Amino acid sequence: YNIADSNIANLGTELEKKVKLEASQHEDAWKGAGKQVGVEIWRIQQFKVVPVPKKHHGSFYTGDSYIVLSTYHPKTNPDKLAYDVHFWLGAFTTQDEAGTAAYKTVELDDYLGGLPVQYREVQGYESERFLSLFGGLRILDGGVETGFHHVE
Amino acid sequence: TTALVCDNGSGLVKAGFAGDDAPRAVFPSIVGRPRHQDSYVGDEAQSKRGILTLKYPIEHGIITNWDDMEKIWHHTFYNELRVAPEEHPTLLTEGPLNPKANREKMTQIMFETFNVPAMYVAIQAVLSLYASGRTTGIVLDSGDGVTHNVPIYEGYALPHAIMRLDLAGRDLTDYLMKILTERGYSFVTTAEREIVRDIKEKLCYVALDFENEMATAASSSSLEKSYELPDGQVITIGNERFRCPETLFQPSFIGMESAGIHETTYNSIMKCDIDIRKDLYANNVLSGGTTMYPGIADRMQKEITALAPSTMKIKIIAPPERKYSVWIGGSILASLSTFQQMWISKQEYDEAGPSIVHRKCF
Ligand SMILES: Nc1ncnc2c1ncn2[C@@H]1O[C@H](COP(=O)(O)OP(=O)(O)OP(=O)(O)O)[C@@H](O)[C@H]1O
Ligand SMILES: [Ca+2]
Ligand SMILES: [Ca+2]
Ligand SMILES: [Mg+2]
């Protein structure tokens, strides 16, 4: 096949990055994100990215999906910021929540110029890095309702 | 304002509303005309197929009859969903490596004929990956028209590693029609192709070891199944059950020199940077109706293991609703205001023309 005459000829381009960076400017949740070292957490709630209050950071509803932005100083420069972005998928989260969390993780990555390294964290499969962010890790029963309308 | 999501498969239209958990209209992507030489679309054409010759406007993921495709879209909007398209932003889908003119003409028709207020054309496999809750993985998407291998890392498809095989469900149906003649059955016409398609979907499976299965089929009738045709005749099928989808692993069954789906998957992974290959091998996501054969995931797991380094951790993800994964991924993404922010508006089309699709849709 010939990529150049095809519908993927513009994938991987500066143009693709520019369009997606612009789109990420339209999510209020990212304003002010990643400005200092620490952990910031949002939960997906009926397709919306909703902040989790700091007093609850580390507690996750098993029925829900979340985005966790870890901002830290890299070894290369103690006065600059680098990022790990984890999306945490509860054992009982619904498909809309997990899919939004994945898409919005990429969007936060775009917003932060591609710098975040992404980590998919399924409940019970959390990475060593995720476990290191927090007896701060607590799983809560229940969660918020799906954003999907069910087709009978 | 609710967006419409329309996944135009080569064989099936799946259409509905963003935010629903499933497409509300699913029907064959066919136009029927009198077999005796004015047209019917979709479910009604399938019903009246006794007196019609059926044609698919999409072949191998590319629209080849634009007049009939317009009939399909018109039917989707006005007869199935019963919506006024000018009131609904519309998400369409497409397989990768299609010629650029296909989406240019999709865009032109949506705006100039259907007057949609906004639209976007998304890559099918990318939607499926998001439907699975991932940003990294390699999707094997196989419908009626095309089998695609799409590796994606951190939300970006890797164009140099995307692969495409113009062998999928319709070719499998045609091959079953052919091999069924060995038993003395005659399936030839377009109406008969739809019967054999049903036989394929109901009775076919992927053998874990093809040669062993052929021996089992000859030793006794233990693998045979019966099927009642619409005229009442009952036929029996045996090794055709697994010889049909074996073609995915041995394309030479239909005369193609191409590598089988296990080898294309491996080849696509090998075109990716070495450091991400382990993540791709652990995240093979199956998508599409042609991935629905019983046994296919186990066979993939076996064949990729044989090709991959001996210690590679390999996992095949086979979502139960994978016939609708593309649609579901579109329903999710079209529910996000930021994704809709990238859509082409009617004004943008008026000023820029079809070329704008390449600058907005990735
Ligand atoms: N259970 C099944 N086993 C085998 N094949 C099946 C099964 N169910 C559906 N198929 C086949 O899958 C195809 C339709 O699936 P699907 O709707 O995913 O494809 P499509 O979107 O029309 O095609 P494409 O995306 O390649 O253009 C047909 O060939 C159909 O016969
Ligand atoms: Ca939930
Ligand atoms: Ca990144
Ligand atoms: Mg399809």
Side-chain angles (χ1 to χ4, degrees), chain A residues 1-16 18-152, chain B residues 2-36 38-54 56-270 272-314 316-362:
Chain A
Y1 271 91
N2 199 36
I3 283 166
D5 316 323
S6 82
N7 62 355
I8 62 166
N10 274 349
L11 293 195
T13 61
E14 286 308 302
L15 173 63
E16 183 187 20
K18 167 178 190 82
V19 171
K20 286 165 179 185
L21 174 61
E22 174 169 344
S24 78
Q25 302 312 122
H26 297 261
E27 172 53 75
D28 293 342
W30 312 147
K31 309 182 154 93
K35 296 294 208 203
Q36 63 195 282
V37 164
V39 170
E40 291 165 310
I41 309 193
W42 306 260
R43 183 171 61 174
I44 307 309
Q45 306 184 191
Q46 302 89 40
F47 299 107
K48 309 310 217 213
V49 181
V50 181
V52 177
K54 195 184 222 104
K55 75 163 131 55
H56 284 3
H57 286 189
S59 291
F60 299 92
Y61 281 95
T62 190
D64 289 336
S65 294
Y66 294 74
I67 298 173
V68 175
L69 178 66
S70 178
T71 302
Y72 68 100
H73 293 305
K75 176 179 171 164
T76 44
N77 187 329
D79 299 326
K80 299 289 180 121
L81 301 175
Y83 305 104
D84 288 344
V85 60
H86 307 257
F87 59 113
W88 187 89
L89 305 178
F92 296 94
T93 196
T94 49
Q95 188 167 23
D96 58 303
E97 290 174 333
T100 297
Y103 183 86
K104 284 284 180 171
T105 292
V106 179
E107 189 176 287
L108 178 52
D109 199 349
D110 290 341
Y111 185 81
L112 294 174
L115 187 55
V117 180
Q118 303 177 13
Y119 293 90
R120 178 169 185 273
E121 308 295 1
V122 179
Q123 177 179 350
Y125 298 79
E126 298 95 335
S127 65
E128 198 283 325
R129 284 184 174 81
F130 190 82
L131 296 179
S132 297
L133 298 174
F134 305 110
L137 183 68
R138 305 209 38 101
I139 310 307
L140 311 176
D141 286 349
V144 295
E145 181 80 17
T146 181
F148 273 153
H149 176 86
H150 182 51
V151 177
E152 292 270 61
Chain B
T2 317
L4 301 187
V5 179
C6 185
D7 174 26
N8 287 114
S10 298
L12 287 170
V13 179
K14 277 87 55 190
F17 302 96
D20 288 354
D21 69 359
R24 276 173 184 281
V26 178
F27 60 89
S29 192
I30 61 172
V31 179
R33 288 171 169 89
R35 174 164 51 72
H36 295 253
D38 75 279
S39 62
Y40 303 73
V41 177
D43 277 343
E44 186 181 2
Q46 189 71 273
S47 80
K48 308 172 65 87
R49 78 185 173 211
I51 71 150
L52 303 177
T53 295
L54 303 178
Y56 284 86
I58 302 177
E59 299 176 292
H60 297 308
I62 300 167
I63 295 156
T64 63
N65 185 330
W66 284 95
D67 282 355
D68 280 2
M69 195 62 211
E70 188 181 320
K71 286 174 211 303
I72 296 293
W73 279 322
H74 180 280
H75 182 84
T76 303
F77 292 135
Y78 292 97
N79 300 331
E80 288 297 333
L81 294 180
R82 297 179 57 188
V83 295
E86 71 271 14
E87 300 184 354
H88 296 275
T90 298
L91 176 60
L92 302 177
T93 74
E94 192 179 32
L97 284 168
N98 261 20
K100 281 172 63 175
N102 194 74
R103 66 175 41 197
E104 293 168 3
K105 287 180 74 60
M106 293 170 103
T107 301
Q108 179 160 41
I109 297 178
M110 287 300 135
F111 284 118
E112 287 189 27
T113 297
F114 295 111
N115 197 31
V116 296
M119 60 161 290
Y120 191 95
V121 182
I123 299 291
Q124 292 157 352
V126 173
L127 296 181
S128 295
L129 191 74
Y130 284 126
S132 83
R134 286 171 178 76
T135 70
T136 291
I138 178 173
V139 177
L140 188 178
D141 190 56
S142 189
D144 198 48
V146 189
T147 302
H148 299 101
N149 312 272
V150 187
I152 298 157
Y153 184 66
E154 289 202 355
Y156 285 77
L158 301 173
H160 72 280
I162 288 169
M163 294 160 188
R164 179 172 173 147
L165 170 61
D166 274 354
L167 192 170
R170 196 177 304 166
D171 311 284
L172 294 192
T173 300
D174 288 348
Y175 180 61
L176 184 54
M177 296 168 75
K178 171 184 188 154
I179 64 174
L180 282 174
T181 80
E182 300 175 359
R183 260 169 204 275
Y185 306 131
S186 202
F187 296 102
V188 156
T189 65
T190 61
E192 291 170 344
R193 176 174 284 107
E194 298 303 316
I195 299 166
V196 178
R197 180 189 49 66
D198 189 64
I199 296 173
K200 175 191 73 170
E201 291 171 9
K202 298 290 190 43
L203 296 180
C204 283
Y205 70 94
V206 172
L208 186 64
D209 186 304
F210 179 70
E211 289 302 320
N212 293 344
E213 206 78 357
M214 293 281 298
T216 300
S219 282
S220 79
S221 57
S222 74
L223 301 178
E224 304 191 343
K225 295 289 177 168
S226 295
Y227 180 96
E228 193 180 305
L229 301 176
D231 75 4
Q233 179 185 175
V234 187
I235 70 172
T236 295
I237 67 157
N239 60 20
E240 298 90 351
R241 291 179 66 200
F242 59 86
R243 291 166 56 206
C244 167
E246 187 62 18
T247 305
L248 295 166
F249 297 90
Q250 307 193 60
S252 62
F253 279 21
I254 64 170
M256 286 177 68
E257 283 188 354
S258 324
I261 57 162
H262 58 299
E263 189 158 6
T264 69
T265 297
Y266 170 78
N267 289 347
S268 175
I269 293 177
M270 290 300 282
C272 298
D273 289 343
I274 177 148
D275 292 346
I276 73 159
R277 293 179 190 157
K278 295 214 163 253
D279 284 331
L280 297 180
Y281 274 120
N283 292 280
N284 286 276
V285 176
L286 299 187
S287 172
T290 291
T291 74
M292 285 299 290
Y293 292 95
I296 195 176
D298 290 333
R299 180 71 177 282
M300 283 302 276
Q301 176 76 22
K302 181 185 158 182
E303 300 291 354
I304 294 172
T305 292
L307 299 178
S310 75
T311 59
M312 183 79 53
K313 173 54 62 146
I314 295 159
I316 315 295
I317 313 308
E321 295 307 299
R322 66 189 175 276
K323 287 194 197 191
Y324 308 105
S325 293
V326 169
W327 191 90
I328 292 161
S331 177
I332 299 165
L333 265 59
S335 291
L336 307 183
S337 71
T338 52
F339 182 65
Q340 283 218 27
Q341 190 269 344
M342 302 170 282
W343 293 20
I344 305 153
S345 73
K346 169 83 201 145
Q347 177 181 347
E348 285 178 320
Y349 176 80
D350 284 347
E351 298 184 3
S355 288
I356 194 153
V357 73
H358 307 309
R359 311 195 305 267
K360 300 213 84 179
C361 301
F362 305 94

